[PDB]
């Protein structure tokens, strides 16, 4: 997808 | 009182880009903007001089921040590790907003991106805390680098940062 994260970056 | 102005020299392989400044909202989010700048001087004895952007999509946002695994999954705070999520007062509403990348409620570090659309699914959950000053066309050239999937096709560094109001 579209998210912004740190760690475990999702779909 | 007036808001900080930080600027990113920005690098691609190597290769002067161009400058990017930021107005910093110390105004409405005081402790998130004073992470960024005293990240952006280097001040604590660590920041973001020398880091990347290790994940660009096209018509989303540019992110980067990690200063320490140098991988995208890094970084940490001024405050210690982690930490709160300030306020949600402002909107991620176009390009040029900056906001805090996390993993979930709460642990906000050093990571951020920098939005080149509108991205309102965001709102509330990442803490938007600046904005694109002077620069943008930078910002542009760089998501020209960037994919789908966020892999940069060129390592694009700040080659140098700091404060200038």
Same mark, same amino acid.
């Given at each position: 997808x579209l998210l912004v994260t740190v760690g475990l970056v999702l779909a | 009182?007036?808001?900080?102005?930080?600027?990113?020299?920005?690098?691609?392989? %190597?290769?002067?880009? %161009?400058?990017?400044?930021?107005?910093?909202?110390?105004?409405?989010?005081?402790?998130?903007?004073?992470?960024?700048?005293?990240?952006?001087? *280097?001040?604590? %004895?660590?920041?973001?001089? %020398?880091?990347?952007?290790?994940?660009?999509?096209?018509?989303?946002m540019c992110q980067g921040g990690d200063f320490t695994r140098?991988? *995208?999954?890094?970084?940490?705070?001024?405050?210690?590790?982690?930490?709160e999520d300030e306020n949600f007062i402002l909107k991620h509403t176009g390009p040029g907003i900056l906001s805090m990348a996390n993993a979930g409620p709460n642990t906000n570090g050093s990571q951020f991106f920098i939005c080149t659309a509108k991205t309102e699914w965001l709102d509330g959950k990442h803490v938007v805390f600046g904005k694109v000053k002077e620069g943008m066309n930078i910002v542009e050239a760089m998501e020209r680098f960037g994919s789908r999937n966020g892999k940069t096709s060129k390592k694009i560094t700040i080659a140098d940062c700091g404060q200038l109001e």
């Open positions: - | 009182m007036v808001n900080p102005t930080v600027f990113f020299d920005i690098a691609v392989d %190597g290769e002067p880009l %161009g400058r990017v400044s930021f107005e910093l909202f110390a105004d409405k989010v005081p402790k998130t903007a004073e992470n960024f700048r005293a990240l952006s001087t *280097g001040e604590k %004895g660590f920041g973001y001089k %020398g880091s990347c952007f290790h994940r660009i999509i096209p018509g989303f140098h991988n *995208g999954t890094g970084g940490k705070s001024i405050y210690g590790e982690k930490f």
